[PDB]
Amino acid sequence: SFSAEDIAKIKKFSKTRSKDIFDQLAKSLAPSIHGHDYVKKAILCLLLGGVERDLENGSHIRGDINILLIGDPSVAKSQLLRYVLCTAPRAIPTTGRGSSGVGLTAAVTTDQETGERRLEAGAMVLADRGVVCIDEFDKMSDMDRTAIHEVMEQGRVTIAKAGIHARLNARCSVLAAANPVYGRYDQYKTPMENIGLQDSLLSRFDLLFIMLDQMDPEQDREISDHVLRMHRYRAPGEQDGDAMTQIYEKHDNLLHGTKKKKEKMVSAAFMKKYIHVAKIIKPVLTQESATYIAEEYSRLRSQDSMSSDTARTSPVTARTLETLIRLATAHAKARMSKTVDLQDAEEAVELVQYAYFKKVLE
Amino acid sequence: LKDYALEKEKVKKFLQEFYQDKQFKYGNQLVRLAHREQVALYVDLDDVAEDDPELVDSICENARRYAKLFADAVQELLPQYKEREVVNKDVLDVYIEHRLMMQYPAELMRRFELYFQGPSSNKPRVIREVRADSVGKLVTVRGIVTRVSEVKPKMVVATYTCDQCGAETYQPIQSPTFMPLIMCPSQECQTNRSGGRLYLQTRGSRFIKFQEMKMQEHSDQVPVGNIPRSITVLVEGENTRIAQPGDHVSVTGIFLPILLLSETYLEAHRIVKMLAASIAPEIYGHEDVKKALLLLLVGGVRGNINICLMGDPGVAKSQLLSYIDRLAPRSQYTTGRGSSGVGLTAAVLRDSVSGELTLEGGALVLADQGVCCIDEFDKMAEADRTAIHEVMEQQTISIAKAGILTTLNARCSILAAANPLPAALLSRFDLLWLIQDRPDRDNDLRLAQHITYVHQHSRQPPSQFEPLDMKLMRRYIAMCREKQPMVPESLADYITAAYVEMRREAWASKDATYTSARTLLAILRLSTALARLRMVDVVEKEDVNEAIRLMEMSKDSL
DNA sequence: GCATGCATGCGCATGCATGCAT
DNA sequence: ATGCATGCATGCGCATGCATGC
Ligand SMILES: Nc1ncnc2c1ncn2[C@@H]1O[C@H](COP(=O)(O)OP(=O)(O)O)[C@@H](O)[C@H]1O
Ligand SMILES: Nc1ncnc2c1ncn2[C@@H]1O[C@H](COP(=O)(O)OP(=O)(O)O)[C@@H](O)[C@H]1O
Ligand SMILES: [Mg+2]
Ligand SMILES: [Mg+2]
Ligand SMILES: [Zn+2]
């Protein structure tokens, strides 16, 4: 693939920062990638995750989140996917045509040695309580999407071939990266034409993000500065020209910059430990936030008459309320606490506002 | 070490001094066993707890020895309780009587079997956790049956008759394979040294029923990222014909190896099976979509009912199907192509015992006389859809391929879920329910409040009418299904009219309508089901009115 | 809407190696 | 002491199911 005295460090950092914990964790997610704060927050929410609930009648409520990123080429989506693969404990990359439905889903093979039928686990079966990254999601066939639908809905796989039948657990989370049908995102056309996906598939996803490569001179200057600062960097202790744990990372003149001396980034190991500890915690929802969330859900649904000229990326269904609750639970997990507060729901509401609506240019 | 004579005496006195249950149960059991009115006796280890608990531990550690001791004790106790001769005696009883009239193995004269029931204090184990530590002990396992073998006879004691003498030789069998005898060990032949040869007899020999079965772990007990494991159980005696494929069972038995590696197996002792419109209280709304499910569960007087629900995504159709699958006693649930083709219908497979080919059925075969649930119906293959249509219309499946020529009986009721109409569904399905969603602030607020309450308190909001548990609903359905109402002759003059005008209305609305004798048959079936719900012998008008209202509501869903 | 390419189970026979019951 | 039945590949012939390309 734990320490002893870092518990004091974790307790001190939590009791000190409190509210700023989530912001600092989101900011220090990936120094090598510039911008995209909301995407980093969503990735942190995936790392934390929701709460699975089981009731008396045996009904199951999903606790995982799903995010789909769509945008122009060279906006650092594959880099984010690779970073999630590196950081997540159980992370599995499965490209579009790399694996078929038989590879993603467990299958049945008749054993010649004994004459019996045995089950061989698929890609999603192995990644229980983990992360599955799918690059080039648009290239995937329809049948694979139909197979993935059951896992995205209830996280279980039903298999049956005469003489044997079973149900396997597939409680996983999915990252997906896809390109627009026209290659580059057309500003004028509606998002429905650009995405080119059925409503059910989008609804089963929890969050949709649209990223654009706007050629603004200031943004280009900042991006070039960051890229060349990262490229000029060389690891300390290595001779020039050669071929080939503190809570806050040591400041570097190249990785951070002179201006960034006022702030520091969290170390990777401490971040991993804190993420694990937070994932252990089981928060509880309060009554104050429930009415607020319900009223804001009603406002979101009634916004059809208040959308102005902006369009909606994804339809609003009953799953959106569960997504709101799950994001609130994740944000509550971000800082070590016990109850859900108002700002906790406000953050998820802001995320939904940013994700769900987009302006259309003439 | 300990002498077995003292423990045998303790067992004998225990079998005679357990009045504390007021009738003497063991006396009656022994009387029935002596008069050949009972062929099986079960011993409760919870009953033994009143006596010295050391016997319980000893039995849990050396079960086979104590089973044999109990059998011997019961055999010795049998003569005392005898009062009369056998009223009607069969072939084996005739042989036993003739042999007694004229040493014999104990099991040859014996005609009863003894079994142990696991203590309630003994916690059931997991198939994954039974290992070398449990070899030779008594264990309890909960699982799901997947494969069962046919019933066949198995030798217990073999009887040989000599060529030149009337003496009969007896050979016990304690191995899967045995070596038949040749020479006669009788004293007459030994003295004369005639060298006669023995011949096997089927009539004098003793046979017992034998069965194989396989069990798998529940999906809840499977660890992270693993696959359920399987175990093999042997069935003999009166325990035969109890377990069937697809059932959730609990078996108490012994863990024994087979011959320095060895292969393990289980020997079974006890096998056990594991308004009213309150279906899924967790889901808000859909008041008129739940009575149809109740009528589907109750069924008609062929009287089968098939229901299809078409709806936009996010209205939670799958949860209703899962609840129906869980509630029904015999039920199967299909998600899509993961159980296509061979998953349905049947396939030919090798046998564990006979070594030949036998037919094993699919989901539809298992769901015979039950309810089947299908999700994402529109995504199924053409062959699966044709098979489903054949099941719906004819209730039998016909298979004719290389090596297979069979007609399987499948009397199952189908509930299907789908997304958005084709004429096949309207012409074939009895009831179609189209669920459409539109934004309303008050309804949205109510649904959000209910969903938040469900997520917070982990229980549906309380109301004036409390719902009911699954056991009570199952018992109520079982009680309701007993009766069979009849339609009175006079009400025909009503019902026919209620049909004709309806069709006339359908003739007025030429846009999109479908009516035939199938609608009348569905109305009659629904009316009979509603009358059965009231336990009335004669169908009443209110049932017909309710069925007509339900059909109209289904039709009015655009 | 259908024939074909690509696995995969089924049933079978055939050849090479070895381990011991009559 | 010796010859043979069996375990373990491997070719042969076949049917069956899933995907796609015109
Ligand atoms: N905002 C950014 N900050 C730093 N580097 C970037 C940024 N956007 C793109 N890049 C660089 O451009 C490359 C984009 O490649 P890739 O991540 O494969 O694009 P995509 O995932 O959109 O196909 C990366 O190697 C990355 O180093
Ligand atoms: N009327 C309702 N009452 C309560 N919860 C609902 C309702 N409709 C939808 N939901 C919630 O929305 C989710 C819908 O998911 P799912 O059942 O997979 O939808 P579908 O079955 O339509 O694909 C469920 O988890 C359920 O908790
Ligand atoms: Mg990329
Ligand atoms: Mg569904
Ligand atoms: Zn003789």
PDB file of C-alpha atoms in Angstrom, chain A residues 5 32 39 50 58 95 101 103 108 136 153 166 173 188 203 216-217 240 255 267 270 274 278-279 285 296 332 343 345:
ATOM      1  CA  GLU A   5       1.345  11.559  18.275  1.00  0.00           C
ATOM      2  CA  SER A  32       0.526  21.880  -9.802  1.00  0.00           C
ATOM      3  CA  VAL A  39     -13.728  21.442  -9.049  1.00  0.00           C
ATOM      4  CA  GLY A  50     -21.547  11.061   2.250  1.00  0.00           C
ATOM      5  CA  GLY A  58     -34.098  -3.110   4.356  1.00  0.00           C
ATOM      6  CA  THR A  95     -10.936   4.293 -20.116  1.00  0.00           C
ATOM      7  CA  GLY A 101     -19.171  -4.413 -19.957  1.00  0.00           C
ATOM      8  CA  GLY A 103     -14.609  -6.233 -17.725  1.00  0.00           C
ATOM      9  CA  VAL A 108     -19.462 -16.280 -14.831  1.00  0.00           C
ATOM     10  CA  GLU A 136     -12.874   9.568 -22.659  1.00  0.00           C
ATOM     11  CA  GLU A 153     -28.164   3.836  -8.715  1.00  0.00           C
ATOM     12  CA  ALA A 166     -25.654 -13.828  -6.922  1.00  0.00           C
ATOM     13  CA  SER A 173     -17.808   6.464  -6.669  1.00  0.00           C
ATOM     14  CA  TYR A 188     -23.738  29.885 -28.837  1.00  0.00           C
ATOM     15  CA  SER A 203     -29.752  12.673 -13.770  1.00  0.00           C
ATOM     16  CA  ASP A 216      -8.179  36.421 -21.516  1.00  0.00           C
ATOM     17  CA  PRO A 217      -4.740  38.118 -21.474  1.00  0.00           C
ATOM     18  CA  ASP A 240      22.018  20.816 -11.586  1.00  0.00           C
ATOM     19  CA  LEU A 255       6.569  26.268  -6.179  1.00  0.00           C
ATOM     20  CA  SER A 267       1.448  18.401   3.456  1.00  0.00           C
ATOM     21  CA  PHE A 270      -1.163  15.028   6.946  1.00  0.00           C
ATOM     22  CA  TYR A 274      -7.017  14.092   8.184  1.00  0.00           C
ATOM     23  CA  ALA A 278     -12.877  12.830   8.808  1.00  0.00           C
ATOM     24  CA  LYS A 279     -14.222   9.900   6.777  1.00  0.00           C
ATOM     25  CA  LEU A 285     -28.419  16.378  10.495  1.00  0.00           C
ATOM     26  CA  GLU A 296     -34.202  26.178  -1.349  1.00  0.00           C
ATOM     27  CA  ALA A 332     -19.796  18.716   7.661  1.00  0.00           C
ATOM     28  CA  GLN A 343     -23.247  27.519   6.454  1.00  0.00           C
ATOM     29  CA  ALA A 345     -25.963  23.765   3.690  1.00  0.00           C
TER      30      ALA A 345
END
